[PDB]
């Protein structure tokens, strides 16, 4: 499960998820899986989706993961009074804005990359689309 | 040729002419009198040899039993006796289970100018080899 | 559409009355009558029947393409007539003809009877062979569902009433 090894601080203001994405072209492979909807990816979701593509391609083809949790999510457990301090870190998320290239792939034919990245889309909480390397 | 009246083939290398444990009923469940297996087979298979596995045809008539005709040994069984290992494939092209050659093969392919679909001497040289290749073979003529 | 573009032939004997959207086509074996959908144009003259659309009705080509396959079948039925074929399979199964009543004994405590509709009559050669003869095609398939629905084909012994164009696939009696 991906997670920052260390961070300066345990806990983080909620913040927002405004604006558009920076990762919008396929920058390492030949094909890519791109985020369309807006939202937060948990580390467990990213791992479940990463598995789907690796099942499908055997031990062939290389995969890059362009997003990284980085943001800690806290929660107060059951039966707790409000106030009394910020929750305990339970899992880690990455903030995703539309256009972020999430996954890339190269080493399989385009037809198989679409199938392989697709057997992943059912694991993600935001709509996605298949994108390709582009000249310039 | 003509239409089907049940003719296939069920047996291994000529170690038994009429065997109980090997095939069983499956060769005499139709009209095959298990007696002709040795009373026709020996009555005729003491003419080429009684030691390579040969697949034959089967002809059952409304009268008594059947007459089968043989013709050529299988291409794959030929490799166990004089080409490589004891059984054949097993672990094919992972390692290099041998080095036969086009020469050893041809003498048991050209001699099949009727039961070996092919009006080309050359074809048999590589066609019989087609059977002999999956067992991981480097051809070194 | 492509059905619709090919008109229908009317040989001799045929009658063709076209009161707007009512049709009566008669020949040597009936007086078949049908109310035509509004959104259609079966035209006359020549020796044909073109099936086109009418301006102001949406579908139209699906509607006039249906009249093609309908009047097509009608013209055949008033000349040559239609014949289905239910062959009986499954022991203790009777079939005999007492006029226009079909005698069925298909394993039940009560021999089922079936009264035949208008022009769809029928008969039997034996106790396992039924053969119907009629004019309408919408009705012979209908009689064939009634006669067939009584005892449907069980898929383990292929028993019951079956079409003669019928494929009775079977499966194995479980395992162990």
């Amino acid at each position: 499960m991906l997670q920052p090894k260390r961070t300066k601080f345990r806990k983080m203001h909620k913040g927002r998820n405004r604006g558009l994405a920076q990762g919008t072209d396929v920058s390492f492979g030949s094909f890519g899986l791109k985020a369309v909807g807006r939202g937060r990816l948990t580390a467990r979701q990213i791992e479940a989706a990463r598995r789907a593509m690796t099942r499908a391609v055997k031990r062939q083809g290389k995969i890059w993961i362009r997003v990284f949790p980085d943001k800690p999510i806290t929660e107060k457990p059951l039966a707790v009074r409000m106030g009394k301090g910020k929750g305990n870190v339970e899992y880690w998320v990455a903030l995703i804005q539309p256009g972020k290239v999430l996954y890339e792939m190269d080493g399989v034919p385009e037809e198989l990359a679409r199938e392989a990245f697709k057997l992943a889309a059912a694991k993600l909480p935001i709509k996605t689309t298949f994108v390709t390397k582009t000249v310039m | 040729a003509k239409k089907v009246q049940a003719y296939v083939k069920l047996q291994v290398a000529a170690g038994m002419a009429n065997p109980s444990p090997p095939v069983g009923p499956a060769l005499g469940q139709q009209g095959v009198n298990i007696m002709e297996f040795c009373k026709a087979f020996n009555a005729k298979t003491d003419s080429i040899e009684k030691g390579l596995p040969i697949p034959v045809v089967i002809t059952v008539y409304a009268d008594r039993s059947f007459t089968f005709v043989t013709k050529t040994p299988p291409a794959a069984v030929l490799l166990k006796k004089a080409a490589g290992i004891k059984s054949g494939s097993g672990k094919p092209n992972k390692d290099k289970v041998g080095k036969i050659s086009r020469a050893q093969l041809q003498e048991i392919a050209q001699t099949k100018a009727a039961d070996m679909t092919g009006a080309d001497i050359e074809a048999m040289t590589r066609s019989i080899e087609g059977t002999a290749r999956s067992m991981g073979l480097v051809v070194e003529d | 559409s492509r059905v619709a573009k090919a008109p229908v032939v009317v040989p001799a004997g045929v009658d063709v009355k076209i009161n707007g959207q009512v049709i009566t086509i008669k020949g040597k074996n009936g007086e078949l009558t049908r109310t035509l959908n509004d959104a259609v144009e079966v035209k006359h003259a020549d020796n044909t029947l073109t099936f086109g659309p009418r301006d102001g009705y949406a579908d139209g080509w699906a509607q006039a393409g249906t009249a093609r396959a309908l009047l097509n079948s009608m013209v055949i039925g008033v000349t040559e007539g239609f014949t289905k074929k239910l062959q009986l399979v499954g022991v203790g199964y009777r079939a005999a003809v007492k006029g226009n009543v079909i005698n069925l004994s298909l394993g039940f405590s009560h021999p089922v009877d079936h009264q035949l509709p208008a022009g769809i009559t029928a008969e039997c050669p034996t106790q396992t062979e039924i053969v119907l003869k009629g004019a309408d095609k919408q009705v012979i398939g209908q009689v064939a569902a009634d006669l067939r629905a009584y005892r449907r084909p069980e898929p383990y012994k292929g028993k019951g009433v079956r079409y003669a164009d019928e494929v009775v696939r079977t499966k194995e009696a479980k395992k162990k």
């Binding site: 072209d25 791109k34 256009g99 582009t134 | - | -």
Partner: protein, 94 residues
């Protein structure tokens, strides 16, 4: 070898360009050499398909603008953030 038909822009800034894309067109620009930049407006569907063959990004294209001809090369491109379209393109009078 590809020839693009363009009209000169009468406005500029975010409003017109979002209005252009709202009008199924999109802006682009021609700069380079000694002469001044040339603000242009393009038909969207035509250039999307052109640039879908690598030849677009390495050949000298011809822009036809008010029935004249400016020889340029594609230099940079802004693509839609996540849809298959285009927001803007740079051409250089090279």
């Amino acid at each position: 070898m590809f020839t693009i038909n363009a009209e000169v822009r009468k406005e500029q800034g975010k409003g017109a360009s979002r209005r252009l894309r709202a009008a199924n067109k999109f802006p682009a620009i021609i700069y380079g050499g000694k002469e001044a930049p040339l603000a242009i407006e393009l038909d969207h569907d035509k250039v999307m398909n052109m640039q879908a063959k690598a030849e677009f990004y390495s050949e000298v294209l011809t822009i036809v603008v008010d029935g004249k001809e400016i020889k340029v090369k594609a230099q940079d491109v802004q693509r839609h953030p996540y849809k298959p379209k285009l927001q803007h393109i740079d051409f250089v009078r090279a």
